[PDB]
Symmetry: C2
Subunit: 475 residues, 2 copies
Amino acid sequence: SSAVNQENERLMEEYERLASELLEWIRRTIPWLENRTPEKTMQAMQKKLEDFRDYRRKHKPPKVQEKCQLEINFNTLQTKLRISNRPAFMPSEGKMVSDIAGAWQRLEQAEKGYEEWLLNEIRRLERLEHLAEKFRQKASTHETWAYGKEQILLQKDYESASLTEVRALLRKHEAFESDLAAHQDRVEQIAAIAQELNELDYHDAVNVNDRCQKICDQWDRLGTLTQKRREALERMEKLLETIDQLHLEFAKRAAPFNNWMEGAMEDLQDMFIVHSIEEIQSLITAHEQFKATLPEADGERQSIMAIQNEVEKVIQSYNIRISSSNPYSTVTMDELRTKWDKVKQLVPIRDQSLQEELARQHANERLRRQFAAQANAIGPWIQNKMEEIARSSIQITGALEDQMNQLKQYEHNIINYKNNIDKLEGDHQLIQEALVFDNKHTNYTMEHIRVGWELLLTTIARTINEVETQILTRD
Amino acid sequence: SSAVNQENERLMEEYERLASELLEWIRRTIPWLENRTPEKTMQAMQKKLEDFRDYRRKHKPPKVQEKCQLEINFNTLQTKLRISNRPAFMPSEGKMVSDIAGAWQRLEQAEKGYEEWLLNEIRRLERLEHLAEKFRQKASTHETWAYGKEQILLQKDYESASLTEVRALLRKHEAFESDLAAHQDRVEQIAAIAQELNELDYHDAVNVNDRCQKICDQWDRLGTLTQKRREALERMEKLLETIDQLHLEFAKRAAPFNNWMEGAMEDLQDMFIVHSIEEIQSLITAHEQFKATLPEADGERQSIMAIQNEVEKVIQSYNIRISSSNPYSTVTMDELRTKWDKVKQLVPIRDQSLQEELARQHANERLRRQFAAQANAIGPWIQNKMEEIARSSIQITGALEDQMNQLKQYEHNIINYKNNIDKLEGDHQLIQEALVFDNKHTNYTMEHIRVGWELLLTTIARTINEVETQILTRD
């Protein structure tokens, strides 16, 4: 009888030693799950899932078949104690047989979404770890590109530059603008990566947001810093372009004008030699016409001096480099004036010179005329007396005494006419001393008169003589 | 009787003392005229004419009246000795009375064109003295202008010049040409004055002809010397203009091309992350298309390297200054190549990178498929057995023993199917270790199978148990 009671004890003691053995597991296990305390890296957060596998795979199943094994024992030892009759057993209250239904429903609870969690974290640390590294890299290459760019952008090289040098920098600046717009994208990306990096509560979101902020701030500063340059370069080009135009204009006009002044200075000093009033007057008509051009000449002079003034003005009103000196022209504005002064100074000297010759020529004509007037009278007078002597033979009375009487009267006329020949002779001397050897106002010439007068004096002498013989070789 | 003979002696002695007194004058005078020995200056040559005046005016006339006075005496003492009868006198044979007609015709000869001469000389020394002074002056101002002109014309300043500097000198050279043509006339005049100066036997014709010759020789040398310059300057401008064009072209093309290389280097290194074969293939299609552009990329590369070569060539084939360096561009041809090499070096690294991910994704799909295949079989298998157990009550014979017989057979099937669940579990672990958490090839998931299989094991255990009670609370 107690032989059956011996195993009906082990078959009810079996329950205890096991039903408990389980209960303490759902005890030690419900805390392990339920945890959900995130991890640092991903590589460590997945080792946490490898633990869950080992659990749900090799540790939890055997328990499920033990939760079932029990209650099966709570029957093979229940319905069995009915077929032997002697009230069964509902052991340890601290090991209920209808409550392990809760102790497991407990574990099942704490396990709820644990793997769902584990995964999502593996996946966040997935993207995260990637973006972090991408950010670190995409930023580093940008920061490296940026180094010094702002500084060189502030350099002012272009102040002492030439129209072409500036024009060149302007073109290299185009390159810079080009390259600048290139990276526009990289900046937007660097922002975006830092952005998402936040959304995923990246542990270092703080520092990436800062590093990114600097980059975006710089980018903006860089943008306008780049625009200042274009403006300055574009402005500098404008000025130099203007100053160049002026210089050019000045050169194109000072040249010809310098030739004119040089030409004039020569003309106003050209040596001349004349011998007639008409000649010296052509020289006067000429000089007169020249002086007539002096007005507009001064026009051009001032006009040119204007061009120079603007140049020197725009330069001065921009404290800009580039020696006012004109690359396209040799002659200065200051030496341009000295020349003009000379022209001027030479004019009064020229006409004063022209004036004296005019007087000279006129003085010469006077001598010419005065000589002509007298010779034109003396000439015929001498001719007339020759004729009077050539006659004298006639006489109504019968020659000799009456012819003599007449000859002596002519001699008296002759004698009394001498002073006229003298005068002539004297004005002749003046004509020659004046280097005048042409006289269109008479066909005479001191010589003709001399011979004529000398012939006259000889003819009377001869004739009076012949008549003296007559009144002798007869009387 | 001898009272009349006393004055008829003085009136015949009068003849002698005078007729002689004259004869010696035409003697001393014929040599004075006849002279015609030119003089130095004009001022002295006219003092020679002032002598002639004094002669022909106050010295010669009185003699003419003395030549006449005689012969008149040769009659008042001839016809007179007839009216007293006693043969007259024809005195001194060395004092003829019919020959003073020749002694005077002699003087008249020697006087011939003496004044005509004197004048013409006054007139030659007139023009002469003027031209000489004009020459001396017009030459001096030219020689002064010329000093140094030839030297500065030979200066080569323009070698190390810039396109603009040369372009400037070229324009200042225009001025020089202008001013040069200006004096063309002055030279022609200087020649002419020396010319005439000869025609008038200028005493210094020798030296003026030399001084003039130099001037004309210089003028010619000056002319061509001036033309060399224009050519050199025009030539230099040509070169610099060409070299500039090239530099410019190079700059306009190296810029964009430099942006491309920089852009590529980035793309070929851009970090990426994928989770599907489709994703990694888009990355491959892209990279493939990029590489497709590499050919023409090299085209442009070489083309640009060409431009540089010509530049460096024309320079080198004219031993011309101007550092080959490109004013319009920063990036060098040598650093341009280093970049290109980098692009190249990065390609094989990129596809090698792209290659590994493709393998990874494929490896992943394999695990995905292998898992699906098994789960899609195990799933229904577990479902089917639940149904077989769910029945088993039937039996044509009348439950229990025959139902049990069947339950035990199912248990045996279950047991023998376990290895399948194991495998699954193991490929599950691979899928997770590969960071693959998506599987479109099955609607199962390791979990579903676990629960299912665990439910199965519990259902048979339970059922076989319940049937054990049956065959007890009946048997």
